[PDB]
Amino acid sequence: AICSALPTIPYHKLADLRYLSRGASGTVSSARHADWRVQVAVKHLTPLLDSERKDVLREAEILHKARFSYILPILGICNEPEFLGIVTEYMPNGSLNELLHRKTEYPDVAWPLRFRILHEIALGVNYLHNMTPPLLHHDLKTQNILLDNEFHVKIADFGLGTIIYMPPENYEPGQSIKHDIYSYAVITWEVLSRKQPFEDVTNPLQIMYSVSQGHRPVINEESLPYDIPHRARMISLIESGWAQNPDERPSFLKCLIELEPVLRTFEEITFLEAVIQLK
Amino acid sequence: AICSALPTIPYHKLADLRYLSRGASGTVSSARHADWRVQVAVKHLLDSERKDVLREAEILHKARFSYILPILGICNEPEFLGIVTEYMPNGSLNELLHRKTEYPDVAWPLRFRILHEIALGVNYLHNMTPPLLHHDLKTQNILLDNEFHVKIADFGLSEGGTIIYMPPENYEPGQKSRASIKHDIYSYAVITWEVLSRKQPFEDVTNPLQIMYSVSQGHRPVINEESLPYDIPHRARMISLIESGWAQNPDERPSFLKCLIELEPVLRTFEEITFLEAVIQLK
Ligand SMILES: COc1cccc(-c2nn(C(C)(C)C)c(N)c2C(N)=O)c1
Ligand SMILES: COc1cccc(-c2nn(C(C)(C)C)c(N)c2C(N)=O)c1
Ligand SMILES: [Ca+2]
CATH class of the missing domain: 1.10.510.10 (Transferase(Phosphotransferase) domain 1)
Known part of the structure; x- marks a missing residue:
């Protein structure tokens, strides 16, 4: 059974963090990864909850496991005590x-x-x-x-x-x-x-x-x-x-x-x- | 850390198999997946030539990114071994x-x-x-x-x-050269x-x-x-x-x-x- 791990992204690596939309799942922001040099999108909810953490981790696992040509590709996860979120490819043409x-x-x-x-x-x-x-x-x-x-x-x-x-x-x-x-x-x-x-x-x-x-x-x-x-x-x-x-x-x-x-x-x-x- | 497993694709799930080219690392064919309804590319070939296929599969699966060829699954049968990736319509x-x-x-x-x-x-x-x-x-x-x-x-x-x-x-x-x-x-x-x-x-x-x-x-x-x-x-x-x-x-x-x-x-x-x-x- 061949396995692939989801990269952990340090919050300090995401620059130019600009707001896009706030929805029920969280807030979507556009950014650029400092090392990879690509535009990304970040989804985040400051203290949140003990159960709210279990949601963000579940979405990340789903995206990571459901990788396919027509599924939003997940690039990594920001898992720090200071900031929590998922990083995906940036979709420039909206919904x-x-x-x-x-x-x-x-x-x-x-x-x-x-x-x-x-x-x-x-x-x-x-x-x-x-x-x-x-x-x-x-x-x-x-x-x-x-x-x-x-x-x-x-x-x-x-x-x-x-x-x-x-x-x-x-x-x-x-x-x-x-x-x-x-x-x-x-x-x-x-x-x-x-x-x-x-x-x-x-x-x-x-x-x-x-x-x-x-x-x-x-x-x-x-x-x-x-x-x-x-x-x-x-x-x-x-x-x-x-x-x-x-x-x-x-x-x-x-x-x-x-x-x-x-x-x-x-x-x-x-x-x-x-x-x-x-x- | 969260783990994603690479799907195993039965060979019989691949239909309309056509030859594209013969390369050093193997033969490349186009096909359609019977259940997923997408075009795919398939790369195929004892117990030694087997580990090379599995290695490229693992690397493609771990190196996932916007500018790296997306791997879809692996064919691992006694009858046939090979990797399945997204089909590139415009060649090299x-x-x-x-x-x-x-x-x-x-x-x-x-x-x-x-x-x-x-x-x-x-x-x-x-x-x-x-x-x-x-x-x-x-x-x-x-x-x-x-x-x-x-x-x-x-x-x-990561003959010639x-x-x-x-x-x-x-x-x-x-x-020194390899490093x-x-x-x-x-x-x-x-x-x-x-x-x-x-x-x-x-x-x-x-x-x-x-x-x-x-x-x-x-x-x-x-x-x-x-x-x-x-x-x-x-x-x-x-x-x-x-x-x-x-x-x-x-x-x-x-x-x-x-x-x-x-x-x-x-x-x-x-x-x-x-x-x-x-x-x-x-x-
Ligand atoms: C970072 O994770 C997500 C998850 C789901 C949707 C989006 C997303 N929403 N939008 C809006 C159209 C809703 C602003 C984008 N442009 C997204 C993206 N991935 O680029 C991001
Ligand atoms: C099925 O796995 C691979 C691995 C590496 C390259 C290719 C590939 N080669 N070509 C040639 C240009 C060499 C025919 C394609 N059209 C490929 C593809 N993914 O569609 C396929
Ligand atoms: Ca022309």
């Missing part, structure tokens, strides 16, 4: 959430890139589900689908807010293999429409109520134009993905087998052209 | 520099990012505990990913091939020269042994207008980097950390957009 909803900044997000993003999300989650034992994300949202330098996906913040990606059966306490695909069906809808799921709804409870009654984000000509490539296929994927009955939702394998023919239609140059258009 | 730096018909242009910003990335990768190895030394840096084992970012592979020396990247004092190897923390920077310097000129080092000299004599004396690849034009961005500071890196005396050669610090302002002069334009031009 899928920002790309989809910052419409003045991004008026055109070409179809091939949207499909590649959807393909990559499914590849990362599929990889998790294929580990031994299977790792379940359970918190998939557009906010934690990160975008690297070339707009390739890196999945973060996982296994271990917003309930729009939570399946109806999760509302009541439960004693859960079909969660992730529900979240993925919503993300797919969001990616293809660039609309916020349930725009007309003020209170999150009204969403939760509607979802328990089998209602989903709206599928019509307004939300999903008829000119969307592979529209029919994508609609089937979405509708099966978010089906009320968990048993009627596909595995990520089935989902990938469905996506593969779609992705083969796009030339490699079209992904590059979609990216250059965003700059 | 060597093929980029010397396939002039296939690649008429290789824009300056891309060349500089390639150089910056090789340096970041090697630097990382040098900064591990204990320091990992490459000792076989050549253009043939600098791999290029889908968007022409660098992945360093082949830690087999090319001698042009080997420093003179390493010609007759010893205890030399200044081997790699010499290789990097020759690589830097080769990148900036798109010329085969010592082209005039067609006899490999003669190159070895010339290099002993103090001769290096030709630094003139013919090989390195005046139009080359930051020409002077690069020649300074090359010449100091391939200096006859190992004590006069800089660390990668110093080369990086020199390179940082050079890379900042290129707008982000140009890197993307360069890749589109090659595609």
Whole structure:
């Protein structure tokens, strides 16, 4: 059994520590490693708690064990009595959430890139589900689908807010293999429409109520134009993905087998052209 | 310390297996993983040739970093042994520099990012505990990913091939030669020269042994207008980097950390957009 240890990073090695965002998991800051000469990202919560330490160490172990092409690569851990945090590669293009909803900044997000993003999300989650034992994300949202330098996906913040990606059966306490695909069906809808799921709804409870009654984000000509490539296929994927009955939702394998023919239609140059258009 | 175990990949999980090349350290094939649904590269071959595969696996697994080839798993069966890594669609730096018909242009910003990335990768190895030394840096084992970012592979020396990247004092190897923390920077310097000129080092000299004599004396690849034009961005500071890196005396050669610090302002002069334009031009 070949083993690899996660490097320990001394806090004094991280320079230019600039704030980026504060979330439930912690505060994300950009920095540069003094020795390695690369930009990094740091996640930290001053005294915290005795149990709060057990969380940060658990996320680091998860990222380190779930290493893959579509999972945020972890570079090291800051484990000092003075400062606690995880260090990962720096994602310069933010979250899928920002790309989809910052419409003045991004008026055109070409179809091939949207499909590649959807393909990559499914590849990362599929990889998790294929580990031994299977790792379940359970918190998939557009906010934690990160975008690297070339707009390739890196999945973060996982296994271990917003309930729009939570399946109806999760509302009541439960004693859960079909969660992730529900979240993925919503993300797919969001990616293809660039609309916020349930725009007309003020209170999150009204969403939760509607979802328990089998209602989903709206599928019509307004939300999903008829000119969307592979529209029919994508609609089937979405509708099966978010089906009320968990048993009627596909595995990520089935989902990938469905996506593969779609992705083969796009030339490699079209992904590059979609990216250059965003700059 | 937290431990990550390298996955064992059953050989039968690999489908659509196609031959890519035959190298000194083994045969390289492309494939798709049946469960993970990604393209992969597979490197394969008694009880002695077995430990070499396992060693490169362990090194790739321990040396994980943004500019090092990511290993995905290992095939360890009585029927088949080999390593599985991320598939590099754009081959080696060597093929980029010397396939002039296939690649008429290789824009300056891309060349500089390639150089910056090789340096970041090697630097990382040098900064591990204990320091990992490459000792076989050549253009043939600098791999290029889908968007022409660098992945360093082949830690087999961490029959042979090319001698042009080997420093003179390493010609007759010893205890001092194998522990030399200044081997790699010499290789990097020759690589830097080769990148900036798109010329085969010592082209005039067609006899490999003669190159070895010339290099002993103090001769290096030709630094003139013919090989390195005046139009080359930051020409002077690069020649300074090359010449100091391939200096006859190992004590006069800089660390990668110093080369990086020199390179940082050079890379900042290129707008982000140009890197993307360069890749589109090659595609
Ligand atoms: C350092 O660890 C993490 C963990 C999860 C997400 C991020 C991260 N968030 N963002 C925001 C988009 C939320 C600012 C980035 N740009 C991150 C990164 N790795 O670069 C960092
Ligand atoms: C499977 O392990 C390796 C190890 C070292 C190099 C390569 C590799 N060589 N090439 C050649 C350029 C030599 C064909 C590729 N395209 C590789 C890859 N990782 O895709 C593979
Ligand atoms: Ca061309």
